[PDB]
Design a protein around this nucleic acid. Structure first.
Ligand SMILES: [Mg+2]
Ligand SMILES: [Mg+2]
Ligand SMILES: [Mg+2]
Ligand SMILES: [Mg+2]
Ligand SMILES: [Mg+2]
Lengths: 277, 94, 94, 275, 252, 250
DNA sequence: ATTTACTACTCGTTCTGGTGTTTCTCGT
DNA sequence: AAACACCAGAACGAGTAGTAAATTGGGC
């Protein structure tokens, strides 16, 4: 009786765990609190598990998460990803060389980037523009999206501030966007690994160990995830993290993000015209 | 019409029999059925009214990605927990 | 993908934990979830394989007349009966 | 404190057959205790009609519970024929009873209802200026053709319709009589729940279930009867059980319970009088 | 012809209706003198008993004690086709309905109804007399009356008992409880029509008697009293011929 | 370098990496000078420890005992863009692929491969050499060899070898799925490196155990491999070997 | 240090047979 | 005659330290 992972589209989006030790009481994921309450967690029915500060994971627990193919993410403030673990063996050889070959050749790389551009904005990019130039186009379009979303919900907008120091305490808007995109990067990384590709090999983003995660996520981030973050910031709640967590998943549910994630990568890589595996 | 599951403990014989008017009792205190939204709500009204000092949990299928929703009556060793909207269940110690 | 419910009795700890990998254990030995057909069948493989002297009943939602179907493993106080195709459950006297 | 209301009939299981045991109300619910003492809970809810086969003894309280949840109780004979029935004594709608009555009392209006039954059954309008007895005669000739057609289509040895159990190892008539009986079961249960009288008929008259026969005969050959030929084709053991099991699939697939109530009102609508 | 059976099982041991007692004593019942059988609480009917009842055309009615409440009866929707339409014809036609109502009025108060009055007008006279009747009985007993506390609780419990035997009579007679002349639209409209005729003759004054002593559990005390009355006075028995007499005035 | 941790909890008590023993003794661990940390069974890692490990860029790999089994590794799907793409470049191009294979061959048998041979042709030589080696080993440890307690021991032995090999590959920063001799398998590169040092130590130890014919050959081989991997620092000596192989791809 | 196999033992729920009661949960 | 309300005991299963053993379910 071997233990194999279930299809990712058939899973729950994400779970956040904090303040307790993680054990494997008789074959299953358990979270024991400081007061000693036990909480069984269905790791087979969860695409991604987020580990907040205060958690201590046992060796066997990490092992179980890999068998059922569940990505484990240690997160920081506003849900920023710190570390992650998973089945290192998991990856398709035919698909790895496919992604790599598409990335190494500049001509092939450019075709892939244009596909990302087209799928993201809904229109083809101007001809004979380089990656650096599309990146410039990207930024201009993004600033407009921020402004439009601000006007639609009634949010005080001063600009995108990435580091938590630059947040004006009562700002709550940037904390929501950074927390929202973090949730998307979580399930996206889990999707890429399950798809059998490398998260490190990117076309638009390069050099970063999660460049491909950023490439894929950016395409649909403002389509669903980010606008949901503005909804939360409008009401200005006490615990913006939780409401965003709840908000992003509901979006993932209605839009069937997990189901449409796997075909998107292959759709993107197809633009290279190299024979798909 | 969606699937329905009712699990009862320490409830008076009145409620146990009442549930047996519509639902199938596969195990001791475990009822299964397939009812509409209204009938389900009527089932719960029977539960909250006829159960005393007992604890009941009822789960029905919905369109959430978990695929189902559950609500509890009374107090039990196993209490449901809300994890950012996602509801699991914890085990309380002594 | 349809709703799934597994009720176990006298089963070894191996199976109880295994079921807790995919399903939610609302009550002692009562698991609830929403899995596909293919997955439901693999869970049953886990049941028939890890249970031996224990008794399990599993009910899932379908397009049959009851709206659901249930199958049992091992022997129990409550045995299912076939009434002209419609299957209920009887209570055996010691 | 403890109200007990019936659920919509379309949301129920069509039928259940019970035999050889006493029926009690152990703590609020329908139970069947066999001679060996095993208990079998029967949900009287989620069951449009309950068939009581020989060997059953029903308690006063059991009949009471069945009436509250609006479940029709039918005592059946050989091959599932119908003997007796019990249900809410009142449980009838005055507006609907008088509507049906008015349509039956007026000679002109009654004929309009009969012609509508003919049209809905065969899929084509009845010949003009024909009386009830004459339309009844046309009906028979076509049915006889249907029997022959159904027999050849399913490869069943056919010699004719034998109603009495005396006149039939040929399993075909036992299947047809058992099949239509199941249809008469849910039909009577539907009519009562709808608030109409089973006794007031337009095509059928004199019988205590004349209206049941009227409604059931319209859709009888659309689904139920041809399914009986399928069972008889294989010529299996326990013909009764297989037919009942087969009928369940039909009531489900054809959504019979759901379509029964609108059928009555659609038929009576031909009277041209505001329901 | 009718029989009440209580505390026993109904079988057909040796060709005929038998009632097996708790002492195991058999009570043989002939198939002739049983047009209708009233089944009081505590009774268990066998399949064979039901089969025989169907052959000889015997109506089976599940009742409470002394017909205090009806729960279920054999032959649901109707039994006699001709009687359903007979009652219907009398109710649908305004001229025939008016004749039936006048008969109800006359039998109830002991005097002919006023001339040139319609059904709607007759209802107004009835209401005034009923309210007056309640007041008169109130002074006759020692009960404080203000209109329709513990006084109403007794009366409402009484009329429910009365509606029981009335419906049972209607069913035994073969008519529909839903088709009414004075009351209409209600599923028990015909029950109310007949019940009002004999309501103040025995039942209501007994309710005031109970309310006078103001005992524990007034609901229960009234029900048992009604049971005793229905039996000793044979209320159900005298109701059925009364019913057909009422509908008769509608045709001639 | 590298560090092995076993039987204890990993925390950040007050500013430094610590391993808490069953006796409650604290053991300071420098997060500097540790490219990779191998977590043997019985270990519990705290969130703060993982956070610190991420800051200093230390790879976390969950291994079995003495790295015998790989179960999970940090930064899944590689973390180094340049090393994965480097490895990819060597495998996609046929000319570079052959150069890498020749180095594997040379490091394996201790002598350069015959000239003007293709990868497929070199694969035939290897198979011939391996079966011959098995036969020779059979003669040395008086074991009846046909190609059954001996195979059960060998199969158990190579599994142990695949563990430390994969752990080395992960620590080196390369992909286990991209192989030169073996291809298509998700652990193709693991097999490539493991075959090089397979007969140097592990396999002859497997014949030794099967020779004594014990009740639990599986456990004894795994435990023996554990003892070998630790004392000989196989995992430690594997990583420089790996980089030498891809360097040959020039 | 973490996890599992295994067993009475404690705790807790179902089932049950002993008391006794009712024929019952209303209004046109 | 049939059914229900009340309760502590008998039976039975789940939860729980105790003992012990492992660090484990294949090959390329
Ligand atoms: Mg970007
Ligand atoms: Mg739990
Ligand atoms: Mg029972
Ligand atoms: Mg008793
Ligand atoms: Mg222990």
């Amino acid at each position: 009786l071997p233990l194999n992972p279930i299809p990712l589209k058939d899973r729950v989006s994400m779970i956040f765990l904090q303040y307790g030790q993680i054990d494997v009481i008789d074959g299953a994921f358990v979270l024991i609190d400081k007061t000693g309450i036990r909480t069984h967690i269905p790791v087979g029915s969860v695409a991604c598990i987020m580990l907040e500060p205060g958690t201590r994971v046992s060796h066997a627990a990490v092992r179980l998460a890999a068998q059922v193919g569940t990505l484990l993410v240690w997160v920081g403030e506003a849900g920023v990803r710190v570390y992650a673990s998973g089945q290192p063996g998991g990856a398709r050889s035919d698909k790895l060389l496919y992604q790599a070959k598409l990335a190494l050749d500049e001509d092939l790389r450019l075709k892939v980037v244009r596909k990302m551009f087209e799928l993201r904005f809904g229109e083809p990019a101007p001809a004979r523009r380089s990656v650096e130039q599309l990146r410039g186009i990207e930024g201009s379009r993004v600033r407009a999206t921020y402004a439009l979303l601000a006007k639609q919900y009634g949010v005080t907008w001063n600009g995108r501030r990435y580091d938590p120091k630059d947040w004006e305490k009562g700002d709550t808007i940037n904390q929501c966007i950074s927390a929202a995109t973090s949730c998307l990067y979580g399930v996206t990384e889990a999707a890429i690994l399950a798809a059998g590709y490398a998260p490190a090999i990117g076309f638009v983003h390069t050099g970063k160990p999660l460049s491909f995660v950023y490439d894929i996520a950016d395409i649909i981030k403002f389509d669903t995830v980010v606008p949901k973050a503005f909804e939360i910031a409008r009401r200005n709640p006490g615990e913006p993290d939780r409401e965003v967590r709840l908000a992003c998943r509901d979006i993932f549910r209605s839009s069937k993000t997990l189901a449409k994630l796997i075909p998107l990568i292959e759709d993107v890589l197809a633009a290279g015209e190299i024979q798909p595996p | 019409m969606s699937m329905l599951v009712v699990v009862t403990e320490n409830v008076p014989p009145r409620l146990r029999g009442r549930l047996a008017i519509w639902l199938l009792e596969v195990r001791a205190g475990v009822y299964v059925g397939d009812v509409s939204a209204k009938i389900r709500e009527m089932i719960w009204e029977q539960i909250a009214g006829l159960a005393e000092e007992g604890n009941v949990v009822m789960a029905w299928a919905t369109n959430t990605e978990t695929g189902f929703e559950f609500q509890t009556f009374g107090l039990n060793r196993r209490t449901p927990v809300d994890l950012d909207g996602l509801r699991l269940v914890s085990f309380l110690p002594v």
